[PDB]
Structure 1
Amino acid sequence: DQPLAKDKVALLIGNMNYREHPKLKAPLVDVYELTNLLRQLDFKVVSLLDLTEYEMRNAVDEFLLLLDKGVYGLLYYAGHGYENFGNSFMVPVDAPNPYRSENCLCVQNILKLMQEKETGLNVFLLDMCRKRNDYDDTIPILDALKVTANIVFGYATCQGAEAFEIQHSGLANGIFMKFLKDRLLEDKKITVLLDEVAEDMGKCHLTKGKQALEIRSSLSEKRALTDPIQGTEY
């Protein structure tokens, strides 16, 4: 009756040095912090910065190869992003200006690939803006996903809105990680943990009325990032 993970695997990407878009600063520190925390929780973590489209697709293929039945998979992305028709896209550092969906990675496609590996848990922490891309002509018509009841999204912000870091950030985390880092070690279902983070963020004066954590979850079982890995000693 303690839920267990077959393994715990994470991919973390922070994109900052954009060639054709405004540069960001905080993804480095955000990625560094979440790497440390997830290693404390016994994840195998790949953590990568300033990825071109090609490097992003390679990194997710490598991450996919580490997933299997019952494995807890987590993806964290800090950098530019957008959202068209409910699909979220991550923008690589070599994106042209303007750019379309074909220059970017679609998070929903990654989730489909993860479900094909029969993971026990799928977590996406998307620390990026979610406004429309006007130049993106195209339409999804993606296939419906299976009902696996094990999917949690923690979006740094709401659809059509922006996610933030502190101007000339230096050492400061972006807003999402500022609050996430103080709760991530808790031994609570990831859904509930993210809900507490949503509440903490709501006390932040800088972002009132412009950024709010959105949780989207179909996770039915009481799964947590602290769950022990099967066959080790807890």
Structure 2
Amino acid sequence: PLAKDKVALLIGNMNYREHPKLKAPLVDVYELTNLLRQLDFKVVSLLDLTEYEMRNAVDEFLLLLDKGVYGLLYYAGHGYENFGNSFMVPVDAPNPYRSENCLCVQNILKLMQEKETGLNVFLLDMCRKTANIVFGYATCANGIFMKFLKDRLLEDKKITVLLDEVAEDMGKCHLTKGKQALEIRSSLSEKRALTDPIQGTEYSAESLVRNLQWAKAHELPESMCLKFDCGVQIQLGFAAEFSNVMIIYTSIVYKPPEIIMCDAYVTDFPLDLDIDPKDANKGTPEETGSYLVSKDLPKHCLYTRLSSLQKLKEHLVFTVCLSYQYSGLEDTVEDKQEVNVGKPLIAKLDM
């Protein structure tokens, strides 16, 4: 059994404006991304999406579901049931909910039902109120579903057999023991698995430009070295937590011996990103809201988390500031430099 290609769209909503926050989507989408990438899936991981951003992400994902393709869609966040229908709640939903402002699962399923895909796995991990589709619906540090799913996902068995084993894991767990926490709906008529290889990777112009636009939509700005007149050199580094989340970190690489102190800090970011200056320039990545890529970031820097890159409609332009003092000097001099790192990650798509 072969896949024409393997694409995945992972969405996690946690920072709700009018509803309770959720912690699990953060680690769950992060761990699911690495595992799916290990299975040779091109992944798009998005955190905290409004209604229009979800509708654009899901439509574009469905466009990739050509004949023979293996697709996986995963959602983690608020959801609600309204007369037999299930809805995914965007971070911009009002309180109380209105179905119109949410994404109907049954509408998406109907759209997937028209594809001639090899495998279509749709996972819903919600906090509640042939197309070879395998729908998984969960209604419950990782969340319960991902804790059991992450331990089985790399198994070389049929996805239905694999998800059925997870249902049995969850049924033994003292938390969801004897509870209706997982439903699996399936129309899989053949032996497909998330581990199946991709057919002979060939030079077809249409699939190569979508693979290279996916590569382009995940390009980070390269390392930067800014030199100030005083002789101080600052390095700007960039890391990615999600397709729409980039960390920026600064360090002083060189400081002249005659300079007693030098503090580098970034400010004046485009207002679409809504970066609070009290959350930027922290001594640890955890202080910025970054708890996953923290172990892979270089130490003893100043960190700023840029979430909401899907909202950036212009070039990422910001100021790098430097406060410094010389030997014997009673006054602290201030100097600045403007930086333009293009449109990083998902911002390349022109939102």
SS at match of 2:72: strand
CA distance in structure 1 between the partners assigned to 2:113 and 2:136 by the alignment: 18
Cα 1:207–1:110 shift into 2, 3 Å: same
204-213 vs 68-77, greater mean Cα deviation: 204-213
Q: In the TM superposition, what whole-angstrom CA distance separates every residue of 1:34-54 from its partner, at most 9, and x where no partner exists?
A: 000000001111000000001
SS at match of 2:7: strand
Given the two structures, how large is their TM-score scaled by the length of structure 1?
0.81
CA distance in structure 2 between the partners assigned to 1:118 and 1:224 by the alignment: 17
| Contact kept in structure 2, 1:111 and 1:122, CA below 8 Å | no
| Contact kept in structure 1, 2:115 and 2:131, CA below 8 Å | no
Counterpart residue number, 2:42: 44
Deviation at 1:61, TM superposition (A): 1.9
| Contact kept in structure 2, 1:71 and 1:121, CA below 8 Å | yes
| Contact kept in structure 1, 2:135 and 2:185, CA below 8 Å | yes
CA distance in structure 1 between the partners assigned to 2:13 and 2:113 by the alignment: 26
SS at match of 1:5: coil
Instruction: Figure out how many residues of one structure are paired with residues of the other and give that number.
Output: 203
Deviation at 1:211, TM superposition (A): 4.9
Cα 1:195–1:233 shift into 2, 3 Å: farther
| Contact kept in structure 2, 1:72 and 1:122, CA below 8 Å | yes
CA distance in structure 1 between the partners assigned to 2:7 and 2:76 by the alignment: 18
SS at match of 1:58: helix
| Contact kept in structure 2, 1:189 and 1:222, CA below 8 Å | yes
| Contact kept in structure 1, 2:113 and 2:131, CA below 8 Å | no
SS at match of 1:195: helix
| Contact kept in structure 2, 1:88 and 1:130, CA below 8 Å | no
Which structure 2 residues correspond to residues 29-178 of structure 1 after superposition, within 5 A? 29-131=27-129, 148=130, 150-157=132-139, 172-178=141-147
CA distance in structure 1 between the partners assigned to 2:31 and 2:48 by the alignment: 16
Deviation at 1:210, TM superposition (A): 4.4
Q: In the TM superposition, what whole-angstrom CA distance separates every residue of 1:52-99 from its partner, at most 9, and x where no partner exists?
A: 001101111221222211111111000000122332210000000112
Pick the structure with more strand per residue: 2
> Of the two, which has the highest radius of gyration?
2
Structure 2 residues not aligned, in runs of 5+: 204-351
- Equivalent in 205, 211, 220 of residue 189 of structure 2: 220
Q: In the TM superposition, what whole-angstrom CA distance separates every residue of 1:13-33 from its partner, at most 9, and x where no partner exists?
A: 000001111111110100000
Deviation at 1:213, TM superposition (A): 1.8
The alignment-based identity, stated in percent, is: 100
Cα 1:67–1:233 shift into 2, 3 Å: closer
CA distance in structure 2 between the partners assigned to 1:83 and 1:209 by the alignment: 22
- Equivalent in 125, 150, 171 of residue 181 of structure 1: 150
Cα 1:231–1:151 shift into 2, 3 Å: same
Given the two structures, how large is their TM-score scaled by the length of structure 2?
0.55
Structure 1 residues not aligned, in runs of 5+: 132-147, 159-171
